[model samples]
Target: GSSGSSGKYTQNNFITGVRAINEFCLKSSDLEQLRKIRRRSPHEDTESFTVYLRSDVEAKSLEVWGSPEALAREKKLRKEAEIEYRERLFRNQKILREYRD
Candidate 1:
C-alpha cells in the first residue's frame, strides 16, 4: 500500500528546494513552502521534492526528519533506554529469584 507522498525528504532536495522557494516566492518563507508541500497530497510530486532550505519565514522547515545528526542522536537515546530497561529487568528477576529462595 502507498503511504502517500510523505517520504524521506532527503538532504539534497532539502537544500535545493529551500533555495528555489526563497528565490521564487516573496511573501512566503522557505519553511512555509516546505509545509505547503508537506500538506499536499502525499503522492509522487509532493513526496519527491527533496530540495529545500531552512529560513525564518517557515519555522517548520527547520524541523529535522532524516539527518545524520538526528539519526545518531536517536540511536544513542534508544541504546540508553534499552540498557536501562534491561538493567531493570535483570534487577527485578534477581529480586524475584531471591524471594522464591
Candidate 2:
C-alpha cells in the first residue's frame, strides 16, 4: 500500500517532509511554488510524481536566465574595439616618428 511510510515524495507525505525542510533550511517560501513548477503532480503514477519533483528542485535552484547569443555578440564587439584602439596607437606612433625625423 502507498501509505507514504517510505521516504518517497508522495502527496500524502511530501507536504510535511518538504515543509520541514523549507521552514528549517530554505527559510520563508511557498509550497505553491514547487506545486506550480511541478504542475503534473498527484498523477496516481510514480513516473509523473518523479518528474514533478525533479522540476520542482530545478525551479528552486534557478537564479536567472540570459541570452548566450547576446553575450557572445557583446564580447565580439568589445574585442573589435580593443583591436582598433591598439591599431590606432601604433599608427599614431608611426606618424609621430616620421614627423620627428
Instruction: Find the candidate with the highest TM-score and give its number.
Output: 2
Q: Per-residue alpha-carbon lDDT of model 1 for 5-87, expressed as tens digits?
A: 34544443334454444333333343444544342445553335543344432344224333345445555775698799989
Give one digit per residue, the lDDT tens place, for model 2 in 1-101.
24443454334423342543332223234333445433445555543322224444433433211333534455587669879999989977874444444
The per-prediction CA RMSD against the true structure, in angstroms, equals: 11.5, 18.5
Q: Local distance difference test, per candidate?
A: 0.46, 0.44
Worst 10 residues of 1 by lDDT: 57-66
TM-score of 1: 0.26
- Candidate 2 TM-score, C-alpha based: 0.27
- CA lDDT, candidate 1, residue 76: 78
